[PDB]
Design a protein around this ligand. Structure first.
Ligand SMILES: [Cl-]
Ligand SMILES: [Co+2]
Ligand SMILES: [Co+2]
Lengths: 380, 380
């Protein structure tokens, strides 16, 4: 509505950029507010019903794409390649998990990243293509809200290429981290019954560092038609998580809430099961996906951070044991990947030396399709 | 039409079963003649145009399924798993080949197999020739040829077509070896312009041992709307192949003819290129697929004949070099596969006694999905 904006704008907002010109933002937000939504409420409903099936344990989920999307990579060929990666993993998971697989993308809006510390020589950290320039500088890192406008345009293109231009396939659903508010608040819409929905993406999640119960991001998604998701990390409280679930799934609707566990290969086995049982006890028909990526980030001797593939697979296996054991629906995988033949991730600790070459990520290390294949295989 | 039947029944017919009861056949053929076709002529035309694209080099093909389809495997779950295998390989090929991939199945009619030796090794029962002809069992009664089986095959095929989505996308096209004339002749149909088509399958091929130019099977497919294909083996003559092409692609239509090279890992490199160049010279816009299975069959001390995965991959690589070198369109792969986690094929010579466990194939050894994955990878 506009009610919702008011409510959300009177909460605390984390990881929000300092936009240079207040006027330009007002202009941008106006333009976005008066533009077509990227997705449709009927499709949202469609997906929502599918995720109800996933909560009943009769279907599985593969979510995959870049850490930080490149918004010159909005062209037919390259999105085709990303969709092919999804084909590959979907088929693999179907065979490993013996259930139907829903394809979901980290695409058409992954243009913002949250930062642990805001601040080379004490410069401002890179925030994504929707916020600031890639190269480390003074002026480039200056936040430019026109980038949001460019991001919208690229996202529209990607949606067209994906097949959400007209009504018809076996669809590729769209998801990205709903961290930003100026963009996202401008993308709110109402349906035929005045029920509000987020119009930027089918299936948004909230990042680990913006999931405060009394916070803005939760408030937004709390009152939104879209199926919602939330990242969950090792050092979250039982009581915390319960409150979070009450706000995002008050009616205990199966398919509504999705919790993506990212707590690392070692910690997951000890941390996850108490959380899962409490949510089961609370009566939330939640669906758990594993995020074995962000739990297991590791610094290589040369090159950036990487992740050992063995570690990722370990976590996937442990995740399923934990969730299934404690009585929850273990429903699939959340991975960051790429079609490009990169070496950003390596099989194991021995391989650490060859990280450097073929490393193209704007942010976190991604899995090459075949590495991701290994990760999905662990599911059994 | 019916004149076609006359013509085709005039020619020489190989690998045709000795049906026990003649009258029952007449009844069966009548019933089939008066039953709905499994596929439709508009879909055929759809596919035909797609294969024109494949002949221009703007798309690729994955054909895969069982050597000998099991008739009681006609249920939603199991065909879902087969389609998932196709998802997996299609995605893989798309990534390796950097072009759009067409999914085609060895399904809904692969119920007959051609045999070199009518009998086998106490008894000496006649060899089992597919679930549409003979019992799997090793006695004398089951091996008795029963034409009711054709009727059962039709029924199972109808079910599979429904589950595949042709009852009313990212379509799974259907193919099988056009072999049982009694069945197949009964499945001939006419469209709105009285153009005849084979109504059992979208995309039929003829096996290497029934591809005689002046033979029955060629004659049938010669005058049929469906896109047609033909297996091509090591010892085929230049002149032979040319004549074959003239009969199956008289008007030089791109997308019409498909030649599936199955020659073996060693022989393919030397034998294929002269054939490919001659057809190029003849001006036939043909599309070549590799069949690295049938060229490379090997006996196992422990079990029934297997295939080394390394050999299969070798042939795939060699196939592409040969075809691309000599100026023809190398357009994809033809593989006998299964979703089941079997050991019917082994990586290489090292796996001596592993073939013991998990060997369920009615006929020739199949690839497990992951082994097939390796085979598709060789395309690179
Ligand atoms: Cl059924
Ligand atoms: Co990331
Ligand atoms: Co075979």
């Amino acid at each position: 509505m506009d009610d919702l904006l008011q409510r959300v704008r009177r909460c605390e907002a984390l990881q929000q950029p300092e936009w240079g010109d207040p006027s330009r933002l007002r202009d941008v937000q106006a333009y976005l507010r008066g533009s077509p939504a990227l997705i449709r409420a009927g499709d949202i409903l469609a997906l929502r019903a599918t995720l109800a099936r996933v909560a009943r344990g009769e279907a599985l989920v593969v979510q995959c794409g870049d850490c930080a999307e490149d918004m010159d990579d909005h062209h037919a060929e390259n999105v085709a390649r990303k969709a092919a990666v999804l084909e590959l993993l979907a088929g693999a998971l179907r065979l490993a998990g013996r259930r139907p697989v829903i394809r979901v993308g980290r695409i058409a809006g992954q243009y913002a990243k949250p930062r642990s510390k805001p601040h080379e020589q004490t410069l401002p950290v890179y925030r994504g293509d929707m916020v600031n320039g890639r190269e480390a500088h003074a002026e480039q890192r200056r936040a430019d809200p026109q980038r949001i406008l460019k991001g919208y345009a690229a996202a529209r293109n990607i949606m067209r290429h994906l097949g959400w231009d007209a009504a018809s396939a076996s669809p590729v659903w769209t998801s990205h981290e709903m961290l930003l508010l100026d963009y996202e608040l401008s993308m709110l819409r109402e349906d035929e019954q005045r029920r509000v929905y987020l119009g930027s993406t089918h299936w948004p999640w909230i990042g680990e560092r913006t999931r405060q119960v009394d916070g803005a991001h939760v408030a937004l998604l709390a009152e939104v038609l879209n199926p919602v998701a939330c990242k969950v990390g090792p050092e979250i409280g039982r009581d915390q998580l319960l409150a979070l679930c009450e706000r995002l799934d008050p009616r205990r609707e199966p398919g509504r809430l999705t919790l993506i566990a990212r707590m690392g290969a070692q910690k997951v086995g000890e941390r996850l099961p108490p959380l899962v049982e409490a949510v089961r006890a609370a009566g939330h028909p939640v669906i758990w996906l594993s995020d074995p990526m962000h739990g297991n980030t590791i610094v290589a001797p040369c090159g950036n951070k990487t992740r050992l593939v063995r570690s990722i697979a370990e976590e996937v296996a442990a995740f399923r044991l934990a969730v299934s054991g404690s009585g929850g629906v273990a429903a699939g995988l959340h991975l960051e990947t790429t079609p490009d033949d990169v070496t950003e991730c390596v099989a194991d600790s021995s391989g650490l030396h060859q990280v450097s070459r073929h490393y193209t990520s704007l942010c976190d290390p991604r899995l090459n399709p075949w590495q991701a294949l290994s990760a999905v295989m662990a599911w059994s």
